[PDB]
Amino acid sequence: NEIRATDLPERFQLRSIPVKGAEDDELEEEADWIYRNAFATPTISLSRKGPSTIQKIKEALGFMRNQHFEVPFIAFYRKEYVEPELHINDLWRVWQWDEKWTQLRIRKENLTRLFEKMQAYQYEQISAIRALDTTDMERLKDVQSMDELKDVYNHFLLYYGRDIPKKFGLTPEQFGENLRDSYQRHETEQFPAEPLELAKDTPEAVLEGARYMVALQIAREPLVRQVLRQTFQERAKLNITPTKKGRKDVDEAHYAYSFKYLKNKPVKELRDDQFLKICLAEDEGLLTTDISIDLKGTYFEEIKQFYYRDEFSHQVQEWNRQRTMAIERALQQFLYVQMAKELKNKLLAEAKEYVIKACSRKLYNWLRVAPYRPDQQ
Amino acid sequence: EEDASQLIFPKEFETAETLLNSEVHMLLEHRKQQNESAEDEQELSEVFMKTLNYTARFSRFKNRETIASVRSLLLQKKLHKFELACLANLCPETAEESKALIPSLEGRFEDEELQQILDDIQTKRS
Amino acid sequence: MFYHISLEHEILLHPRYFGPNLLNTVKQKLFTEVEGTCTGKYGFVIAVTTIDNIGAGVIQPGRGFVLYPVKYKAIVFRPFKGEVVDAVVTQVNKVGLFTEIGPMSCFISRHSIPSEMEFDPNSNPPCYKTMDEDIVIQQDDEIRLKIVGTRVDKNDIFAIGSLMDDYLGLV
Amino acid sequence: IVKVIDGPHSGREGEIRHLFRSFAFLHCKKLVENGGMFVCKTRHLVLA
Q1: In the 8-state DSSP scheme, what is residue C137?
Q2: The domain spanning residue B67 has which CATH number?
Q3: Which GO terms fall under molecular function for this chain's record (chain C) (predicted)?
Q4: CATH of the domain at C63
Q5: Alpha-carbon distances, residue D24 vs A286, D35, D37, D43 (angstroms)
Q6: Quick one: C34 and C90 in the same domain?
Q7: Alpha helices in A161-245 (DSSP H)
């Protein structure tokens, strides 16, 4: 009954699944999100221009929300309100962008509510390294940053504790700002105390106790996530090289076995060429894969200077050493692993996009109805 | 009928030897170290690999002397063998949590008597 | 739960293996015979630590095969009902949660999970949170559980978990 | 009884039950996947 005798068309109802329609103010937000995520890595909808494309996306989303429009319904009947035949994948792209923007808005609202509740709980508890509920607003605002926003939320939860009843080195925000700017605005803890003194005020008698806390704070810090994100994602010259068993098993059948010494493959080869991504995934499935940017050796050196004291005279030298140890620990925790995971996710997304595009092209080629009638009527 | 909560097991299993997560972890690690050497030997199986990475994520302590000390301080009590593994592995924070998780402890011992043990275990953790 | 018990097993040895390495061959066959298997009596066996002794091989009448009743000191893993263990969540699905109890995998249903832990299908990683989004549970997390049921699928143990008792989550 | 060192099932064991032009339907009991049975090419086999 709902599918057939529903007020809105089934196509629009299916298209706006996460988002049951668009509000007038939400039209602008959904359009902004669609514009942002239309073509980030590859060039898509650059036809429609940036502002013109955004306006058209907003118009299509609004038409769908109000008149329950559908993909083709707006592509044809709303040629003026949308890209006037700019591309075939107009209605579908707009619907996908609207769904994504609605999902991101919902996630941001949930995160903002969670941050507000956590801040209220912390105020009630500690108000009768502190726990300040100021990052909730930042997380709510960070709608575009989905993965980064989630990382920030998780770091905040792990730092404040997440319990629900019912001075060691540089500050995290300062270290993140320095890393983002590439210039160490703030040094390590410039105090005469050293790790020997610091390891007695926990009950361990070891000098890495503050190193663990520093590594955790660095890892669960949205600023660090933003800094690392894209740093390797935009450029990753993955060197394809078969392993000892992969050279024989692949037999040049996958990306990691076709080139015995064909290395230094950038993001362009994998994202732009979905075949390379598919071959890499297949090779890394069973035997092995050769996926390495090989560019850190020099990206990890620059951060080394930042966040550490410059002098070395006992207090100064010890502060520098402790900052270096904490930075190394944070790296080992969530700097190489996080970057590798982000690069792998990006490569998988690029391969999936290449496969989807190839399938769409094949379907368009093979679906065009071109029968052989009498006289080619 | 077989329910470890009520301290009942088959006769064959009653005479078993309990093992701790760290104990099994170090045993498997040593077995791997022995097997990797002596070339021309059948390599480990996915069962060994999965068990290794499963026990490695719950190694409360790496020191065999730590293992020995905890088992020695625990065996002096009147608790059954089954109580030696779960309680030594989970490492609950408070006696209330320990009692809730294991129904056997309910009424078996005093609150402070168990809380001191829990605190000692937490401290023994590395 | 892992345990260290003494088991017995017999293996026939083809006469082609007689020679200076007889005992070595017997040991090798025992290793590659009683590792990783499972039985409904003693449960799932991980590996063998050491061997107690080698019995007297009794050569069968009219057959070259000789059987050795060897007794080996190996470890075993036979989870029982009511035991509480700390596993790692492998996957989150609306149908249920999938974990990995070492050599065994359990599964918990949303019915077992309280109502507070809702679904997050909109977010890319399947996860469950609360209204205030304070507590978060996802994959690759050391989450505890209780073994409320057992099953052996022809030498393949597959128990069932539960999340009703308090203090079951992040430590 | 044959060994499968090369192919999709690297380092796999199992008894052969059915043959084909370029396929072999191996069978075993230790495996649990597909009811304890797998299939792999013929040229990737070795007489154990």
Answers
A1: E
A2: 1.20.1250.40
A3: nucleic acid binding
A4: 3.30.1490.120
A5: 20, 17, 11, 9
A6: no
A7: 172-181, 195-198, 209-219, 222-228
Among B42, B47, B100, select the one facing C165 at the smallest CB separation. B100
Domain total for chain B? Answer: 1
Q: Do C93 and C64 fall into the same domain?
A: no
C91 lies in the same domain as C169: yes
SS3 of residue B34 by DSSP = helix
Which residue of C lies nearest to A120 if distances are taken between CA atoms? C132
- Tokens at D36, concatenated: 């304890």
Of B4, B50, B85, the CB nearest to C81: B4
Shared domain for C76 and C124, answered yes or no, is no
Tell me, what DSSP letter sits at residue A287?
Answer: T
Task: Mark the binding-site residues of D, compressed into ranges.
Answer: 21
CA distance A291 to A274: 15
- CA separation for the pair A144, C169 (Å, rounded): 30
Q: What is the resolution of the experimental data for this entry, in Å?
A: 3.6
**Among C122, C124, C135, beta carbon nearest to A106:** C122
Rg (CA), chain C: 23
Q: How many CB atoms lie within 10 A of CB D17?
A: 11
Chain C partners within 8 Å of D32 (Cβ): 153, 156
- D48 close contact with C: CB closer than 8 A: no
Q: Are C89 and C58 in the same domain?
A: no
Q: Give the pair of three-digit tokens for residue B100.
A: 């809730």
